[PDB]
């Protein structure tokens, strides 16, 4: 067309290459709904290959009926958001064996990498907490060779989440620390996960003034408020 001055000084090998490319070089996927589906689903390792079948039968590793139970028992661990404490060795072990059965590893998880994970979490959270601590205060006795007590708030762990933003996993956790950690003053934070409803301002409904005792849906939410 009009690019004779530019498409010509490409060499003959380059042009003979670039008159051949097409769509259909891959075996990939690109539908992002399907990528999120395959990242969501739990997958169990199966066997069809005969050499790997005799390799997994020799080392006394079991059939997929045990790896599916191991998936379920690695998922059923009380993960550390619910327990409000750093996890222990059995929780680490069960979660890591469930993850290793998710990825395909049908072997055994070593007992020293759990302690390595423990020290990794130690130094990770110590780095984050230290570079939040030395920003609310200038420790004059430290950082030198010759006031009171402060509590770090969630706004501070958002404020030094960005002044030193390299310190994070950049996964979901930093997204929720940026997106949902800051609360407006009518947020009703000290709660029981349900009392921010509109009907808890408008009067507990009483009971059983009826022969058939079918009730209304504004009473069912008061029933579920108690639990």
């Amino acid at each position: 067309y009009k690019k004779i001055v530019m498409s010509l000084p490409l060499n003959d090998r380059n042009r003979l290459k670039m008159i051949t490319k097409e769509a259909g070089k891959r075996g990939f996927i690109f539908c992002s709904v399907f990528q999120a589906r395959l990242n969501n689903i739990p997958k169990i390792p199966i066997v069809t290959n005969p050499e790997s079948l005799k390799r997994v039968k020799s080392n006394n590793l079991k059939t997929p009926l045990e790896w599916s139970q191991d998936i379920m028992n690695g998922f059923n661990v009380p993960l550390a958001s619910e327990s409000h404490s750093l996890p222990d060795t059995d929780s680490f072990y069960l979660r890591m064996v469930g993850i290793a059965r998710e990825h395909g590893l049908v072997g055994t998880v070593d007992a020293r990498c759990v302690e390595l994970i423990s020290l990794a979490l130690d130094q990770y959270l110590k780095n984050i907490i230290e570079f939040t601590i030395d920003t609310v205060r200038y420790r004059r006795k430290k950082y030198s060779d010759y006031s009171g007590l402060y509590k770090s708030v969630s706004e501070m762990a958002a404020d030094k989440r960005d002044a030193k933003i390299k310190q994070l996993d950049d996964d979901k956790n930093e997204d929720e620390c940026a997106d949902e950690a800051k609360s407006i003053n009518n947020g009703n934070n000290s709660s029981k996960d349900d009392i921010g409803d509109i009907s808890m301002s408008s009067a507990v409904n009483e009971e059983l003034h009826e022969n058939r005792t079918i009730s209304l849906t504004n009473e069912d939410i008061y029933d579920s408020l108690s639990i």
Binding site: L10, N11, S32, Q35, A36, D169, E176, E180, N185, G196
Partner: protein
């Protein structure tokens, strides 16, 4: 250079006909650093265990913290649903703009 005019054809293939001069230079100096880091980490991962799955490990090691994440719509939908539980607060009814309380505004501050 061959890749300056190849970047000319790449930019023109996505309908970018006006740009400056140092923009393919910046694209080439990005691609050099990215490929050098990827191949160095892949040489590490091949001394550990070159091949294509080695390159896949070396570019999955650094996908996790720099470029645009993949299919983030369902996590954002979950996060939106956690934020859109709370009903909207009571608004003023005096047809104007209401400020926050005075300590939450950039006025009672000092230098």
């Amino acid at each position: 250079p061959r890749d300056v005019r190849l970047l000319h054809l790449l930019l023109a293939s996505q309908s970018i006909h006006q740009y400056e001069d140092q923009v393919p230079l910046q694209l080439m100096d990005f691609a050099h650093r990215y490929t050098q880091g990827v191949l160095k980490d892949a040489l590490v991962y091949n001394d550990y265990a070159l091949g294509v799955e080695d390159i896949r490990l070396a570019i999955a090691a650094r996908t996790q913290y720099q470029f645009k994440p993949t299919a983030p719509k369902e996590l954002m939908l979950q996060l939106a649903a956690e934020r859109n539980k709370k009903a909207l607060p009571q608004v003023m009814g005096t047809w104007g703009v209401r400020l926050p309380p005075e300590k939450y505004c950039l006025t009672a501050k000092e230098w």
